[PDB]
RNA sequence: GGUGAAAUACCACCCUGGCGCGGCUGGGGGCCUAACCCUCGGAUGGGGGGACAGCGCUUGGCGGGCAGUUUGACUGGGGCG
């Protein structure tokens, strides 16, 4: 629970095949937001089951609650 | 606040289903017509069929018409047993 309140999130994929999670705060330091986008990049790449074959992380995007929609390239 | 398995703003990504249009390629329907076949009927020009069927290779399938072999041993014979 320590983590739960110091800096928690976690994963889970919904039906058809997607994951949902907070990777930073709005006004938060940009670089930082990058740091978290990555946090997700890693943890995810990890969880990524071995029953893959091709384009696994198909579409990865930074989007906001009630705001913009920006697909992203978490490779760099 | 509530109703529930789920909660409603609005901004996200992802499916079931029907249509917009854009690349690939699958089915196919029409004279032609110049290769091609037959051509013509008395001349290398007319005509008749025509991208077909001829025909090269590769595909799969029939296929005794043919081919080359085979189709056991024991056992008061050999077979049948």
Q: Check if residue A58 sits with its Cβ under 7 angstroms from strand B.
A: yes
Q: Check if residue A30 sits with its Cβ under 7 angstroms from strand B.
A: no
A17, A50 in Cβ contact below 8 A?
A: no
CA atoms within 13 A on the CB side of A5: 2
CA dist., res. A74 & res. A55, Å (int):
14
Closest CA to A22 of A63, A67, A59: A63
CA dist., res. A56 & res. A49, Å (int):
10
A57, A45 in Cβ contact below 8 A?
A: yes
State the method. Answer: X-ray
Q: Check if residue A64 sits with its Cβ under 7 angstroms from strand B.
A: yes
């Amino acid at each position: 629970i320590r983590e739960i309140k110091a800096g928690r999130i976690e994963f889970r994929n919904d039906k058809t095949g997607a994951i949902h999670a907070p990777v930073g705060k709005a006004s938060f330091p940009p670089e930082k937001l990058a740091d978290n986008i990555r946090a997700f990049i890693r943890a995810l790449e990890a969880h990524k089951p071995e029953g893959a074959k091709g384009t696994f992380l198909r579409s990865v995007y930074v989007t906001t609650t009630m705001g913009p929609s920006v697909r992203i390239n978490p490779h760099s």
